[PDB]
Design a protein around this ligand. Structure first.
Ligand SMILES: NC(=O)c1ccc[n+]([C@@H]2O[C@H](COP(=O)([O-])OP(=O)(O)OC[C@H]3O[C@@H](n4cnc5c(N)ncnc54)[C@H](O)[C@@H]3O)[C@@H](O)[C@H]2O)c1
Ligand SMILES: NC(=O)c1ccc[n+]([C@@H]2O[C@H](COP(=O)([O-])OP(=O)(O)OC[C@H]3O[C@@H](n4cnc5c(N)ncnc54)[C@H](O)[C@@H]3O)[C@@H](O)[C@H]2O)c1
Ligand SMILES: NC(=O)c1ccc[n+]([C@@H]2O[C@H](COP(=O)([O-])OP(=O)(O)OC[C@H]3O[C@@H](n4cnc5c(N)ncnc54)[C@H](O)[C@@H]3O)[C@@H](O)[C@H]2O)c1
Ligand SMILES: NC(=O)c1ccc[n+]([C@@H]2O[C@H](COP(=O)([O-])OP(=O)(O)OC[C@H]3O[C@@H](n4cnc5c(N)ncnc54)[C@H](O)[C@@H]3O)[C@@H](O)[C@H]2O)c1
Ligand SMILES: C[As](C)(=O)[O-]
Ligand SMILES: C[As](C)(=O)[O-]
Ligand SMILES: C[As](C)(=O)[O-]
Ligand SMILES: C[As](C)(=O)[O-]
Ligand SMILES: [Mg+2]
Ligand SMILES: [Mg+2]
Ligand SMILES: [Mg+2]
Ligand SMILES: [Mg+2]
Lengths: 236, 236, 236, 236
């Protein structure tokens, strides 16, 4: 279980992020939700999770495309929750186009959220985790952080960047009770034959369970690595 | 939990294998122990695990250096336990020497146990897992299945072979309710500064927890991949 | 040889880039130099290369930290040289610091030059290479595009990004007479015991020879991959 | 060029091996051919290469499935040629079948030739290369030494083993004027849409050129790595 621990999950108002926040809440961890969406429905989700799992759940709608906002998300999480044991950098966007047709605006946006937000969030969380003597940074990369697909240059570059950044985070925190790993999902229903051998989608629940495992003490020495949840995508 | 499931763990009379068998037993899975060692003490371990976790535990001392013996281990596990849901190919040996000084006898022995035994065990288990519609093959490779170290040619070659074999197993079983993955441990106290950034040993308990996770339904789409538990070894 | 071909090498006013531009010039390719430095001495280098190898050599001091300037470098190379057969994205910078102490300004600068410049340059060159039916994009990444080192978060993230971007470039151009690969150097004298097994530095001349090989017809089917020139860095 | 150097290429009576031996001969290196086939036609090939390139070419039909025969091939190469600067471990076989249907005889044969022969050959060559202060071991692995395909368990395991063994060889010889690398080819016409993005076959000539490059001084610091020549196979 994760009772007494605080988890911040970026982009948890829906999809994979919500699945991960839900799984962590079920383990007894207090949660800080984040992401865009309908204010009224987000409040329903927040209140629902808190009541269903008997944990404290807050919502911070910080726009993670801005570095100071990402750092602020972490700062306020610590101020209101008292600490930050788990940081799940999940928020992300995408865009398909040939490299020569790829809008610079889209390239910049994808790198800002999919990669730089991981840097800013990690930077703000580390001082706390080092002092606490405990930390779990779980970055949601992609199979595209390990291999590529045509027409997804910005996304693949950003995700590969996340994988590298994860490794550095791990090396800088090695032995300090902190681990940093990157979950690399294949397709999630948030087509299969071309990339996913199992011909089965990965689910937010499975990814939540994977995050829960990485947050456990059994994973104390799992650091600076990738955990592929892709139905065989990267095996071939 | 894993109630109603049967797990065969090779080389589980001590070290990592025993830790994995213990973790699986604690989840409610019936266990088939295997490996060399003292008959009287092995019986004590077997009886102890069965009583402590309320599961059926058997011991088969098959010499896995012989292909037919490995296949026999699986055949008898099914005959006595009724099925084989989880196969942990863990038994292994090592030998240090420069390539030009490496005894052919040692090269052959390491490949036979560290690599070929995985093939024979997997081959015998697959028909059952495919019919059952459920299977979890967990191969204990090593950080040396991904990177190398001087003077460990046979071991590194064998472990890399296991990683490749694991990927093939996954592709051949994709979507059939079966997964095949390779846990790649760093140092386990069964020196650290040179290879393991955390400067902390990996434990049999942690590896057992990792095996338990891979055996869970949350890991249904984790297949054909490696899970490094090495304190940062492969991150640098 | 590369007679009749045009090569643009970013950051070729010194170090690795100059070594690569020199090697390509020796193969008979026309060259477009680029980078910061002393105008008078750069002219001496430019004039020297042209006279020594009997090829056309131009210099464009475009500041590659700006996307439009990178695209302009390629546009003008085509206008003055008539085409662009080889694009070597080499310019890069670095900065050491713990993640929590890493200046956002430095993070942004490193990503802009080490990663985004590869995108902008590649984007501008592709239309030409596709029409020509020939292209060689050679990205100078680093061993740090495959593994990490503590205190180099921005650099490692950017270099990993380059590796991923290289793979996408290759997939989008597959079969069109164009290849895209990433040379990943270890230490170059532009300390060794910790990362480089050979205990020998990699030289600009060796990297130039590696670029020459990738530009050759023998490397027509080498695409979307990395070529490590690191004295064993990534083997362990 | 490679004048004054001796190269031994296993399985060079046809296909990739012959292409590599031919390329090396064109660089001025003396050659030792090896492999099965028609004695009369092999002699024609041998005599032809020697006359066409003005180098010494011998043929040794050692059956590399036997360790002592592999070591003998190297021993006799040194006795008749005076030294062994380049060793290309290329001979290999294959077999397709599901793991549970894979004949143990075929599994053993593939491991013996595709993997163990690399060990025996390397072991016999190393003492000479270390004394000479120069060595180039070029192992012909496959894309299947890095990724897998269903129904090729023995081959994939063996090729992954070769990649690992190559890394160890490099680490044990680091800085001694010796390098060890593994060329990993995609399809060679010795179907494409499923695995090879370029939709173009790799040729023996291209692989020969790749071997020539690795044998050059420019590749002095390229060691313990893989060089994929696969038209994009491993990029996705
Ligand atoms: N869906 C897949 O197949 C898949 C598989 C591999 C990896 N991933 C990764 O999973 C992560 C989550 O994506 P998803 O598939 O669940 O999609 P999603 O749209 O369901 O979730 C993305 C979340 O990001 C938040 N978000 C977007 N921009 C933001 C910003 N500027 N600031 C703050 N929050 C922002 C959204 O509000 C949303 O909650 C992404 O990083 C994605 O790249 C997805
Ligand atoms: N200890 C580490 O640092 C470490 C880290 C990476 C991977 N590994 C892998 O973990 C596995 C277990 O090794 P360990 O470290 O627990 O050592 P160990 O000696 O404690 O356990 C090895 C087990 O293998 C069994 N065994 C040996 N030969 C056998 C044979 N011919 N037939 C049947 N059983 C046989 C033994 O009886 C024993 O129970 C090995 O595959 C090893 O390569 C070890
Ligand atoms: N030196 C090493 O050990 C090593 C090994 C791995 C990879 N690399 C990579 O090699 C590449 C070249 O670096 P180097 O080691 O030769 O260093 P260097 O300083 O000798 O060369 C860098 C070049 O980049 C140019 N440059 C810098 N900023 C620029 C800008 N904004 N616009 C245009 N040009 C700019 C410089 O003028 C210079 O010619 C870099 O991408 C680096 O990351 C270096
Ligand atoms: N053809 C491809 O698509 C491809 C791509 C990836 C890697 N490879 C590798 O390339 C290598 C060469 O195979 P190829 O495709 O040129 O096939 P090939 O049949 O044309 O060549 C194989 C060579 O191995 C020799 N050989 C076989 N068994 C032997 C033994 N017991 N002793 C001595 N020599 C023996 C043969 O006589 C022959 O010259 C193999 O290792 C193969 O796995 C092939
Ligand atoms: C949505 As995806 C598989 O490109 O990360
Ligand atoms: C015992 As080990 C780290 O070589 O697998
Ligand atoms: C200068 As480096 C080895 O960090 O790329
Ligand atoms: C002949 As092959 C591509 O399996 O090495
Ligand atoms: Mg509303
Ligand atoms: Mg006794
Ligand atoms: Mg001046
Ligand atoms: Mg005849």
């Amino acid at each position: 279980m994760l009772k007494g621990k605080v988890a911040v999950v970026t982009g948890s108002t829906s999809g994979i992020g919500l699945g991960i926040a839900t799984a962590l809440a079920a383990q007894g961890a207090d949660i800080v939700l984040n992401g865009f969406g309908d204010a009224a429905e987000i409040e329903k989700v927040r209140a629902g999770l808190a009541a269903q799992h008997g944990v404290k759940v807050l919502y911070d709608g910080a726009d993670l495309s801005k570095g100071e906002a990402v750092r602020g998300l972490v700062d306020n999480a610590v101020r209101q929750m008292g600490r930050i044991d788990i940081l799940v950098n999940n928020a992300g966007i995408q865009h398909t186009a040939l490299i020569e047709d790829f809008p610079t605006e889209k390239w910049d946006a994808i790198l800002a959220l999919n990669l730089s937000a991981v840097f800013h969030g990690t930077a703000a969380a580390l001082p706390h985790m080092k002092k606490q003597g405990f930390g779990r940074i779980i970055n949601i990369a992609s199979a595209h952080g390990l291999v590529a697909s045509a027409n997804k240059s910005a996304y693949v570059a950003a995700k590969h960047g996340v994988v590298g950044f994860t490794k550095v985070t791990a090396l800088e925190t090695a032995g300090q009770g902190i681990t940093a790993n990157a979950i690399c999902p294949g397709w999630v229903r948030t087509l299969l034959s071309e990339k996913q051998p199992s011909l089965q989608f990965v689910t937010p629940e499975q990814l939540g369970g994977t995050a829960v495992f990485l947050a456990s003490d059994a994973a104390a020495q799992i650091t600076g690595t990738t955990v592929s949840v892709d139905g065989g995508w990267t095996a071939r």
